Each structure stands twice: as structure tokens, then as C-alpha cells.
Design a protein around this ligand. Structure first.
Ligand code: NA
Ligand code: NA
Lengths: 427, 421
């Protein structure tokens, strides 16, 4: 039923959706949470330059859900997501049908269109879900090899265990924020090479980390693992994820318990959840794994996704941003399924809304590394900026943007943006 | 509220006045309980009973700020969010009402049967919704023991080292804990195998519950930190050591600790611990300024771990230690957590790290007690252990010893279920 909604020939009577460059064609239909002057934050779906007010659409009888508690009054999408995949699809199918160019029902009802659609330009976007937990993986071979090269000689860069399992840690949920939120430069302990003791001060190596994160759509009970083959059914959708990192703070704190303050000060995600169903046409073969992993981590078929990714940096007051990274999601060595299976193999429970980060996404070439640490090799080769100037690490006032999208024939399924501007550190 | 700490004070609930009772009138910890009378809701332990706060409020015998009803809630979060003045106000009203000489509730038999529930007939649940769980590493002796197997890195003494724990898998005392499966690296094989954990372990800790959060980007000054803390609980950070060794470099422990973490159900308020405040250990070298604090910020909490094999008549005491020996304090941990801007929220759980004293009978895990399975522990009643075996029940207990009474934490227990096969 829902596979008809992936039809590239389908178009909307919301004309901005049919622009080839629009992130939000009728083929996409991501879910989010928005507010405007009409009302408090509530569920919406992006289409063209507009947002579909799901609650309003439901009140008008034009979208229906399982009988039960009203999940569209909620300030987050969790309750909706909890309803499960049949509901996600049912809603997607109704929306695709209603906003198809030839369905006159809502299109020719001007009065009702003015009540159920809201321009993105007049809306404010919020965190799409309440995140119960945030886990962050480490699944780009190229990233892991780059970073380990700064601690260990080339032969020792990738530790054996990295290739046996999708290495990961628990992130800090509380400090995950939505695109657009200004991010204050952190203070903390800095170890200088020529002083016995650390000093306290403003981070001098503030950095981005290009990642994607998936949102869990069905949890699992404590003590009951999710089989690698069932994993994707548990995933609702994806977002872009900037795991802001303070590299000088990190180096000094991270042994042996991992990064902590250096990453917990802020993590930014894009507002619109792109459903996995919408990514179906961009499913591709994941990289070959060698050595062949243990049985519990194996899966048949295609479990990677073809998502072009880009990072830009704009200095305060610059007329144009600088593209600093171009890469793709498809090169990740461990898949979402494998990460989710590994997360639960010991019995740990996942919950609706959980956020799971891919780890910094880095390709093989020098222009495809997903952090400035990598791009500038720890501040040794600075990046030239479009419009003059240069950078090693991020400077106060800079705006960092993540973008991502899947290229179809004459359309794209896009993620929107994942942005943030850096505020000066507290004194 | 300092009058409520009076050791001479006693209750007409006579079981409270037993010297050995964890729940005298001096304590009054908060929790969440259900019974056949009603769904899970806020309560306070006293003697062998529980005070039904909602029921007490309906009867007009305890009052809170005008507002939304925080005592209908299935967790204590809403109540805690009301702030320290409220916590104290409620404590003061309870202490007064249950004082031996106050006839108001004591002589009203009908109403006592409505507002008190025997612990025997109640079921205890997680006292709060935990938005985040962080776990520290602040016992010098523990960190030195562990580092000596794979000692103290310089940074350990410059800051309270910590990591993000897994909130979702924190469970209340009494919950059975299933032995985890995962990747095990054997010494004689190039490649890991998958199987049942062979070195399942406890970690004796305490955790504190955050009572007032802080906004993202606004640190909590070390000196203000304790005002942000509501109370404490016992915390068993169950650990699979064989899974851990293989996974933990470089991003830290993950699956090895996330399968289960158990906390005791009763939150002992920081106010109730006031009489047991003591001088923390000397720190050398002197930490950076942001981490310093004046005064006494350690607490004198005797701690014990027992292990009972399935069907054994008696448990074996395997660890006796005390909270006061922790090198970093709760205040310093909370300051360090927030120094870079990270926000905390009401209900956040913060673990101390494994608590180990200097002597061989005061180490807070079996990894330490048995030196990684080389010196097994003899059990009371026969038998022996290296790591935990299916059916074993592990219990954490803790208490502060006053003159003729104690403020106690209850227990933090769990029985191990076999691994899924
Ligand atoms: Na971050
Ligand atoms: Na644990």
C-alpha cells in the first residue's frame, strides 16, 4: 500500500514540493514538532515550503488514526510513534493521497487550507521527540582510523575490537537540542604540553562531528535482545546529528571511561524525522565486512542508505558559507541494524524516541572527513574560507550547518538542516 | 527543620523506635509504592509502615504549596521539582505529626488504617523517572586496584572522572537481573566468541538524585552544588567484566554495564544525612579552583554487601566499607558534570563509582575481592565464589550510625537469572 507513496512520478498541488531541489517533496513526508502564533507546539509534516498541521487535519476528519488517546495534542511525537508501524504507514498513505495533485478534497477548500497548513517561514521547530536515551556509535572506519592515528602508530590505529563489534558509548540526552539553538563554547580543563598541571579555561579546539542518528520506533524489554534481522522494524526514522566536541577537553579527560564533558555540553539534531519508509528507494549494499562478524551481527540484504552529506561553515557576517565536507552515509562500516542488535545483545532495553548516533562520518578523501580535527589534521592544515580567511577549529560567531539528502530522478528526499551558531564562553 | 534531626525524638509508631530500624523518625525517606488499596504513588517510610502522602493530604494533615497535585503522580519528580522549602515543609509536618506525643493521627484508629500501609503489604517502585544517569569513579582505592590489573593516571586526581550511564536499564531493588550474553575475548583465541558472561559482578556504589536542575550553558558552582541534590540511594552497577575488557577501549564501558543497574527504592534526603556530615579526605594535589569547596562534604555511611546462593539459609558478608572515604565529593562531581555547560534535570541519577576501602574486606566488587578470580571468597554455610552464579542474590545495605538509632537506606537487592540460550 505504502510503496505507492514512493512513486517518483507523484506530485503535489502544493507546488513548492515539486521543485526538484526541495527537500520536502511528496515522496518524503518527514514528521516534526512545530509551533506558530496559531498554537502551541504540536505534530506536523513538511511538504514543499509548508507544514501540515496533523491535529487540525484530524479535527477536520481528513486523517484518521487508531481509536484511542489523542497523540496529536502532544508536544512531542513519542505517543504517535509508539502506535507502531501500521499507524506510521496509514498516516503516510492518507497524506500522500490527500496532497496528490489530483485530489481536490483539501486542495479546492481554500478556507480549510488556511486552517491546516502553516508556512515553514511562520513556524518554529522544536525537538521532534523526548529523547529517553542517546547512544552514539563509532562506525566510520575512515574516521576511526584517522583519530586512532593521532594516539597510536599507523599499524595500531584501528584496534581489533573495532572490526568485531560496533563500538559505542552512552551520550548525554539532556543536552541534545534542535537545529538553530545557539551553542555556547564550553569551559573546562585543558592540558598544555609544557605544563605539569591542567589549567581551566575556554575550549580552544571546538569542533563539529558530522553524523546521522536514528530514532527508535519500537522498544524492547529489558533482558530481550533485538535480533539483527528484526532491527530495522524497530527504527522510525533518521535525522542529522552534530555531535559538538571540545577536543582539548576531550584528550585530557577521556581515558579510561571515554568522552564525557567534551561532548555533553551540546549535541544538535535536525528537526524533521525522515522516515525509514521514505528512505526505501535509497537502500544500497553496505560495505563488505572483513573479518566476517559473529553470527548475532550478520544480516542478509541491503542495509546501507545513499545519503549525500555536506557541512558548511559561515563566519559571522560572511555573505556565503564554505563547504568543508562532502561525504555519504552509505560508507558506514556498521549498519543501523547491527548497531541496534549490538546495543541490545546483553539485554539492555531501548525505548520509543531513543536517539542513536552513527559516529562521525568520514569518507576516504581529504574533503570528505566529518570533523575539523580530521580536515585540518589537528590544526596543522587550516581550511581556506570562501570569501577570505581561514580556520583550524571553530571560532566565536561561526555558524556550522549539516545538510543531507537522497538524490532521486528529478526529486530528492532531504533532511533539512542541522545548524548552530557559537556563543562566547562564560567568563 | 533541624529540630527534626533530634536524636531524642521518637514516634508512636513503635517499630520506628527500635535502635536497629532503618526508618526511625529521624530519617523519613521518600519513595513510590503501590498496594491493593491503590496505584503507585508517593510515600514515606517510618518503622515497618509507609505514610501514604496523598491520603494524608486528603485528610488535611499535610499541606503543600497551592498548585498542581504532585501526590497523584506515579513518580516523585513533580514533588521534588517544588524545591527545598517544600521538602522541608513536608518533613517538618511529618516529624511533628508522628512524634510520640501528637495525638492527632495516633488516636484516630479509623484514619490510621487509611493513611498507613505496612511495608509487608506494599510494592516498591523506582522512586523517580530518571532523565539521565551518570556514573563517576571517585574511590582512589578502587581506581588503583583496577588500574593495577591493566595505575592511577594523573587526570584521575585532577578531576572526578565519569561517564554517561544507561538510564533505561536502571531498576528498583528486587528486580531479577538476567545474566547477559555478549562478546568474550579468550586469552588463547585470536577472535572473540559470543556467549554467556562468565565474570558477572556487582559494583557497590551510592547515587544521588538531583533536586534542582540547571540550564544548558549555565554551570553549577561547586559551592552551590549540594543545594541541587535531593537525596541518596544505594546503587549496584552490575558489570559483566569479560564483556567489558573486550569492548571498553577507547569509548568506555557500554553493554557491559547497560544491561542492568539496581537502586534501592527509598530516597534518603540530604537533610536527614546532615548529622553524619564529615570531613572528606585531603586532596593532593590541590584541585583547580572550580572544584574546591569549604567545609565538610563527605558522609559517614557504613556500607555492606552480602551474597546468598540459591537456597542458602544465610547470606555471606563480602564487603564492609564506608562512603566517607570517597576522594571526590558529590558537590565536586556535580560541579564537574556542569562545568562545560551540560544541563542536569530533576530526577537525574549520579553514581559515586565503586566504593572500596583500604583493606581486603572493604573492596566494593568481586573483581577486586577475588583479584579477578584468583582468590575465591569462602561462603558462610560452605562453598565458594569468584564471580556471581545463577540464582545468587546480591544485596547492598547502608546506614548511618547515630547514638541509639540509625538512618538507614533499606536494601538494594537482586537475584541472577540464567542467560538466554
Ligand atoms: Na556533543
Ligand atoms: Na550495570
Amino acid at each position: 500500500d505504502w510503496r505507492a507513496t514512493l512513486d517518483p512520478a507523484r506530485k503535489s498541488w502544493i507546488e513548492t514540493a515539486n521543485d526538484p531541489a526541495c527537500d520536502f517533496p511528496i515522496q518524503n513526508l518527514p514528521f516534526g514538532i512545530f509551533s506558530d502564533a496559531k498554537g502551541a507546539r504540536r505534530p506536523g509534516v513538511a511538504l514543499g515550503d509548508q507544514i501540515v498541521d496533523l491535529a487540525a487535519l484530524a479535527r477536520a476528519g481528513l486523517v484518521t488514526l487508531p481509536a484511542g488517546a489523542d497523540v496529536l495534542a502532544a508536544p512531542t511525537l513519542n505517543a504517535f510513534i509508539a502506535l507502531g508501524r501500521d499507524a506510521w504507514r496509514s498516516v503516510r498513505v492518507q497524506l500522500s493521497a490527500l496532497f496528490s495533485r489530483d485530489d481536490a478534497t483539501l486542495r479546492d477548500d481554500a478556507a480549510l487550507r488556511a486552517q491546516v497548513l502553516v508556512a515553514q517561514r511562520d513556524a518554529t521547530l522544536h525537538l521532534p521527540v523526548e529523547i529517553p536515551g542517546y547512544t552514539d556509535f563509532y562506525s566510520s572506519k575512515e574516521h576511526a582510523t584517522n583519530v586512532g592515528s593521532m594516539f597510536r602508530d599507523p599499524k595500531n590505529a584501528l584496534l581489533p575490537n573495532w572490526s568485531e563489534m560496533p563500538i559505542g558509548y552512552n551520550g548525554r540526552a539532556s543536552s541534545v537540542v534542535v537545529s538553530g539553538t545557539p551553542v555556547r563554547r564550553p569551559n573546562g580543563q585543558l592540558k598544555l604540553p609544557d605544563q605539569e598541571r591542567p589549567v581551566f579555561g575556554a575550549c580552544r579546539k571546538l569542533d563539529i562531528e558530522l553524523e546521522t542518528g536514528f530514532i527508535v520506533g519500537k522498544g524492547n524489554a529489558l533482558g530481550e535482545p533485538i535480533a539483527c534481522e528484526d532491527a530495522e522494524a524497530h527504527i522510525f526514522g533518521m535525522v542529522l546529528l552534530n555531535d559538538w566536541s571540545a577536543r582539548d577537553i576531550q584528550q585530557w579527560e577521556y581515558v579510561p571511561l571515554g568522552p564525557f564533558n567534551s561532548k555533553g555540553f551540546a549535541t544538535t539534531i535536525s528537526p524533521w524525522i525522515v522516515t525509514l519508509d521514505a528512505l526505501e528507494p535509497f537502500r544500497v549494499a553496505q560495505p563488505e565486512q572483513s573479518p566476517q562478524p559473529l553470527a548475532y551481527l550478520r544480516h542478509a540484504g541491503k542495509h546501507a542508505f545513499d545519503i549525500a552529506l555536506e557541512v558548511t561553515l559561515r563566519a559571522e557576517g560572511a555573505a556565503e558559507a564554505t563547504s568543508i565536507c562532502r561525504t555519504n552515509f552509505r560508507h558506514m562500516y556498521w549498519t543501523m541494524a547491527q548497531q541496534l542488535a549490538h546495543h541490545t545483545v546483553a539485554g539492555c532495553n531501548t525505548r520509543v524516541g531513543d536517539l542513536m548516533g552513527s559516529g562521525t562520518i568520514s569518507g576516504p578523501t581529504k574533503d570528505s572527513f566529518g570533523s575539523l580535527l580530521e580536515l585540518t589534521w589537528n590544526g596543522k592544515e587550516p581550511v581556506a574560507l570562501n570569501g577570505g580567511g581561514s580556520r583550524t577549529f571553530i571560532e566565536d560567531g561561526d555558524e556550522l550547518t549539516l545538510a543531507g539528502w537522497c538524490q532521486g530522478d528529478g526529486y530528492r528526499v532531504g533532511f533539512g538542516t542541522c545548524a548552530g551558531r557559537i556563543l562566547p564562553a562564560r567568563s
